[PDB]
Design a binder for this molecule. Structure first.
Ligand SMILES: *C(=O)CCCCCCCCCCCCC
Ligand SMILES: *C(=O)CCCCCCCCCCCCC
Lengths: 220, 16, 220, 16
């Protein structure tokens, strides 16, 4: 059924990694690699509701501030795993100027200063870290937050480029099972973990394109 | 095909 | 030289009217009809700095709350005229799902509740009115406001469609000289006019596409 | 070509 990536204090309405090519000053083509939103509603996996955190310890940051450490501190209802089936079927790099970015949107009942820390992991080790501080905008009784077109670094662009140009889907998948992202959204003043999302990847082979499932994170 | 070699030509200098 | 559409309290950093076509759930094409922003910096016209408001009375709303009435109340530094050379060269309507919208972005030294009232005029008479209320987001010491993807109504879509399919540029221009927009941004609590922009149109014939100039509004 | 007729097939019913 439907799932929301939401804790008691923060909900992630949207998340998307994209490539935008400017053909001319008035013409833009945009390809979505991964996406969560109104166009791609979140659903659970009928075969697996939850993922035990012990099954993924080795794929994410270890020690203080790492996934295991964060989950133990809680709240439990702020921890999720997203599995993405990425759409790499684009040739929008070829012509014009390109922009790789990631955009995300959040809602909260409270007005907070939030910190979003995103860690890219290769073989379980942290390789890239991006930290962004966001402020609220009051809207319809709640508070809205947006990370608008946060740029991908040269290592993430190079990774995508080489991944797209592999001759086989199995090579793309053996590369992607070693690539993870850990997103932690925190209340900057209280240090409370508002949302913590562990992302795992596979290549999509659907005519519908990019797909995803939301899994609860548990320790049983 | 080596997944380790693929991630190494991207992150070998970044591994710290 | 460079010009900012800005009064003492509010600056319009961005304005764009666009058509977005979804080819598939992960593929989008966007065409800009008109645009003001970092990609299209604002410049004055070397042949005309200012437009006298008396030369355009008959093209905009009359009586209470109309252009003349608003300018007299002031402040004078909040009144501008923008001339757009619209880019109608697109065939993005043909396939897939379409979305016509307008997005704009503002900055202010103050935290206000702003009201943006947009009036579409045909032959000087008001035909469409859209009113939007926006709240601030604190950013880098100032306050940011955004009207994100405000939808164009069926009359504006129909107008664009028929305009694009005219066999001659002179017919497009004789239609466009009778089409105007009056945008008024107000402080909802104090009623002060923060920005008032009168828009006039022509078709673009440049390989560079959509163009614009900013003119000061005066009464001399 | 009439610019008035063009704007009338869009706004004739809206003119109020
Ligand atoms: C700074 O480095 C920005 C954050 C790093 C990556 C954020 C999410 C990237 C999503 C992966 C795109 C699809 C790859 C198969
Ligand atoms: C609701 O009606 C939205 C506001 C009405 C129009 C806003 C600006 C439209 C810009 C014109 C596009 C180019 C036409 C030649």
């Amino acid at each position: 059924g439907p799932r929301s990536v939401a804790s008691s204090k923060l909900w992630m309405l949207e998340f998307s990694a994209f490539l935008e090519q400017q053909q001319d000053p008035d013409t833009y083509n945009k390809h979505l690699f991964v996406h969560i939103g109104q166009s791609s509603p979140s659903y659970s996996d009928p075969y697996l509701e939850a993922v035990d955190i012990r099954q993924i310890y080795d794929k994410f940051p270890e020690k203080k501030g790492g996934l295991k450490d964060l989950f133990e501190r809680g709240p439990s209802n702020a921890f999720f795993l997203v599995k993405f089936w990425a759409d790499l079927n684009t040739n929008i790099e070829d012509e014009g100027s390109s922009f790789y970015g990631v955009s995300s949107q959040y809602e909260s009942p409270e007005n907070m200063i939030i910190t979003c820390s995103t860690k890219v992991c290769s073989f379980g080790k942290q390789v890239v870290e991006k930290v962004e501080t966001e402020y609220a905008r009051y809207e319809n009784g709640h508070y809205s937050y947006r990370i608008h077109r946060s740029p991908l670094c040269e290592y993430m662009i190079n990774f995508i480029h080489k991944l797209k140009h592999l001759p086989e889907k199995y090579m793309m998948n053996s590369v992607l099972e070693n690539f993870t992202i850990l997103q932690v959204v925190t209340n900057r003043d209280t240090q409370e973990t508002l949302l913590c999302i562990a992302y795992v990847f596979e290549v999509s082979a659907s005519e519908h394109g990019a797909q995803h499932h939301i899994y609860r994170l548990v320790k049983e | 095909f080596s997944p380790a070699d693929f991630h190494x030509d991207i992150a070998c200098d970044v591994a710290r």
